[PDB]
């Protein structure tokens, strides 16, 4: 019964996920501890995710204060849980991604995982991602072995969906390898479109989206993407999807209401989603979704409505919470680590091979 | 009787060390290994060296290059030691300092170990400075322990030094704890100067320092920069003393002959090792001398002169040839991290106290 802790920081940028669990014959979750991202850090983490000046002498000390805020939220929930540092065999953290570049072989996590360490007194697993590139893969997504490992049906054939800032789908097929790729984007967009507008961080329960109208043409040629034409192994980022991207459609095309937009983004995601998942699956029965997407009243519906022959249902009904998924998976990736058995998935990833995945950091 | 591989490449930029060492009762080199560094890649290092644009894009571009070569030399020495790479229990690797700002509290060395592990199939541990600068260290010198545990004589006193790009020292004071520091610039400046003048990389057996003339004016005001002054852990770099900050002290005196101010650089490098030494230990009776600085006839002679209370030959001297002793320091440190033993020293470094350096990343 090793415990064990997981820090996700995904791009949405919305806070810092800590969990705990307990990894003996199956995997538990003991407990959870979400930090919202400081405002002043969200930003400069943004700042990094584009080229620029100085980026060395910026990342690093943008490093320190993520780390700092990590090891506040792991002593925060190790204090409220009465266990001690010790007690808990590792942590393992995904870090930050503020480059992701599979076309040039390397994506960049940040997170000093020293100093991570030397503040928690506990060994830290990290720096999953750069062996499944260094392998030829694409580095992403990485859970769908958690996923196969948790949700692993026989009698089913079910697709597991995190919708974060980005979407991404581990297909549990009987008989075959375990696949899996982004799908495009999940929220990135809509968070994004209302940043811009307006100045929100995010639409709550899609309820803006769902004030206003698809535009059809719009939805086309967001639609008309390269990547969304793509197959098998597959990753994206802010890189790809972003603001910019968005307007330089919106260019070409006439003025529309902004909730017209906003709705169109969300349709956007679900039909990326659907046609990437049924175009791979043909044959689900069951979609269980994880992320914060999950919270998408809008979106979780228009989903179920695209994948008629599929039970779209959060992982909620399945007994683990969606927003504590990616989380619970580090954790188990750093046991995955210690243990020495293979992190990714080739199918997925595209790499030569299945790669123990992480570097270890001692306290 | 395990065997390590050790990869060290210094701040000079001349090339790549690969050592092959047994760790038995003691410490044996079994082979070295050089590379000369390319053209280009040496350039496009000291092009991050500075603050710069788009350098998170560039250092994982040169990063590549980089592990690509050390793989290759790796490759090359086994196949000519006869060698697998089961054989080898793991590789130390320093990687490539492109940043050093203990002030800021951050070191930045590059080297992708994980796709160091991929190329050669050799477990990897790395990324060691960082650990002790999370412990509140300067993150250098490294070697302390390891001249420690080589020459650790206790009938005699001696210090061990280093001369590089930069100078530092070990000071192994029969009973006292082991200290140490960097004394300030080796061969840096030499190489930088006459790479100014003439293009040249260094200036052999010291031939043209010896062909000028020390000017007392210059020397007095080089002495004069503040880190001279300063005692106890210290660490410094190409952020201090490089070719612009010499440019500042010529332009404030007169014009001089270029072999005058190569004679004074030596003299530099000399005097502020000399008095950084005898000031922290004045009963030294010897001085073990490695790296490529032991290499400069007119350099070793003046450090003879400056002390003449102590025997100063090279470490070939007794036993150890001067040009490998850092690539095997990063075996031993790959050693250590393995039996979970102390790689950094307090008395040395600053730190809070003995800290496991570095990270593993298995193959
Ligand atoms: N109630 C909600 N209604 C709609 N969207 C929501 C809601 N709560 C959270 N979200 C979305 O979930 C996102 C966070 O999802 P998360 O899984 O943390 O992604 P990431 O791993 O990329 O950070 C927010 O940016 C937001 O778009
Ligand atoms: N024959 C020589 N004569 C004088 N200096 C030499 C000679 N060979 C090497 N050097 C000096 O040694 C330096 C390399 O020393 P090295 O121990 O590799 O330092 P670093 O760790 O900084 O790379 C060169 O830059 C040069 O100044
Ligand atoms: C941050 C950094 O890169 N420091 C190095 C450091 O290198 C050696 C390996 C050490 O860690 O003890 C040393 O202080 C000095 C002289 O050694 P070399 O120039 O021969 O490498 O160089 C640089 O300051
Ligand atoms: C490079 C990177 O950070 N990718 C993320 C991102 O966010 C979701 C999706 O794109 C996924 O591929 C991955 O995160 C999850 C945890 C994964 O690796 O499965």
Same mark, same amino acid.
């Given at each position: 019964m090793p415990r064990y802790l997981g820090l996700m920081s995904g791009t949405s940028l919305d806070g810092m996920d800590i969990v705990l669990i307990e990894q003996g014959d199956r995997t538990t979750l003991l407990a959870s501890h979400y930090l919202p991202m400081p405002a002043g850090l969200r930003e400069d983490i943004l700042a990094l995710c584009v080229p620029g000046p100085d980026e060395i002498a910026r990342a690093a000390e943008v490093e320190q204060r993520w780390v700092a805020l990590a090891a506040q939220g792991v002593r925060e929930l190790l204090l409220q849980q009465q266990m001690?540092?010790?007690?808990?065999?590792a942590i393992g953290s995904h870090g930050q991604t503020i480059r992701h570049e599979p076309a040039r072989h390397f994506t960049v996590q940040i997170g000093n995982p020293a100093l991570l360490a030397e503040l928690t007194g506990i060994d830290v697993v990290a720096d999953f991602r750069r062996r499944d590139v260094a392998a #030829? /893969?694409? #580095?992403?997504?990485?859970?769908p072995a958690f996923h196969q490992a948790l949700?692993?049906?026989?009698?089913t054939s079910r697709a597991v969906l995190n919708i974060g800032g980005f979407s991404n789908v581990s297909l549990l097929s009987p008989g075959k390898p375990v696949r899996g790729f982004d799908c495009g984007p999940g929220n990135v967009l809509m968070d994004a479109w209302i940043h811009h507008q307006r100045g929100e961080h995010f639409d709550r329960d899609g309820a803006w989206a769902a004030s206003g109208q698809v535009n059809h043409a719009l939805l086309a040629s967001l639609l008309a993407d390269e990547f969304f034409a793509a197959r098998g192994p597959k990753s994206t980022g802010r890189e790809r999807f972003n603001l910019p991207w968005l307007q330089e459609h919106l260019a070409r095309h006439p003025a529309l209401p902004a909730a017209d937009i906003q709705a169109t983004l969300l349709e956007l995601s679900a039909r990326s989603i659907s046609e990437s998942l049924l175009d791979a699956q043909?044959?689900?029965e069951e979609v269980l979704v994880c992320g914060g /997407?999950?919270?998408?009243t809008a979106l979780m519906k228009r989903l179920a409505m695209l994948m008629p022959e599929a039970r779209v249902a959060s992982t909620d009904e399945y007994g683990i919470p969606p927003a504590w998924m990616e989380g619970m998976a580090f954790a188990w990736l750093a046991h995955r680590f210690l243990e020495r058995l293979p992190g990714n998935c080739p199918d997925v990833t595209g790499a030569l091979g299945p790669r123990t995945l992480g570097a270890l950091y001692p306290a």
């Amino acid at each position: 019964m090793p415990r064990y802790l997981g820090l996700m920081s995904g791009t949405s940028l919305d806070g810092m996920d800590i969990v705990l669990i307990e990894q003996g014959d199956r995997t538990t979750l003991l407990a959870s501890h979400y930090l919202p991202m400081p405002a002043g850090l969200r930003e400069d983490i943004l700042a990094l995710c584009v080229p620029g000046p100085d980026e060395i002498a910026r990342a690093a000390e943008v490093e320190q204060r993520w780390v700092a805020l990590a090891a506040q939220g792991v002593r925060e929930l190790l204090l409220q849980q009465q266990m001690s540092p010790d007690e808990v065999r590792a942590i393992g953290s995904h870090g930050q991604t503020i480059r992701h570049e599979p076309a040039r072989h390397f994506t960049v996590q940040i997170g000093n995982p020293a100093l991570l360490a030397e503040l928690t007194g506990i060994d830290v697993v990290a720096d999953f991602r750069r062996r499944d590139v260094a392998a #030829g /893969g694409q #580095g992403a997504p990485l859970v769908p072995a958690f996923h196969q490992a948790l949700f692993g049906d026989d009698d089913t054939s079910r697709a597991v969906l995190n919708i974060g800032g980005f979407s991404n789908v581990s297909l549990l097929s009987p008989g075959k390898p375990v696949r899996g790729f982004d799908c495009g984007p999940g929220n990135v967009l809509m968070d994004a479109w209302i940043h811009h507008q307006r100045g929100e961080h995010f639409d709550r329960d899609g309820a803006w989206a769902a004030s206003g109208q698809v535009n059809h043409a719009l939805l086309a040629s967001l639609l008309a993407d390269e990547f969304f034409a793509a197959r098998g192994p597959k990753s994206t980022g802010r890189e790809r999807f972003n603001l910019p991207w968005l307007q330089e459609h919106l260019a070409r095309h006439p003025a529309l209401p902004a909730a017209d937009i906003q709705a169109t983004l969300l349709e956007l995601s679900a039909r990326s989603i659907s046609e990437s998942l049924l175009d791979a699956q043909p044959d689900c029965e069951e979609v269980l979704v994880c992320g914060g /997407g999950a919270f998408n009243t809008a979106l979780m519906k228009r989903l179920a409505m695209l994948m008629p022959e599929a039970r779209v249902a959060s992982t909620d009904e399945y007994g683990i919470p969606p927003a504590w998924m990616e989380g619970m998976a580090f954790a188990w990736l750093a046991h995955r680590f210690l243990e020495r058995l293979p992190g990714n998935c080739p199918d997925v990833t595209g790499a030569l091979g299945p790669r123990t995945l992480g570097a270890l950091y001692p306290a």
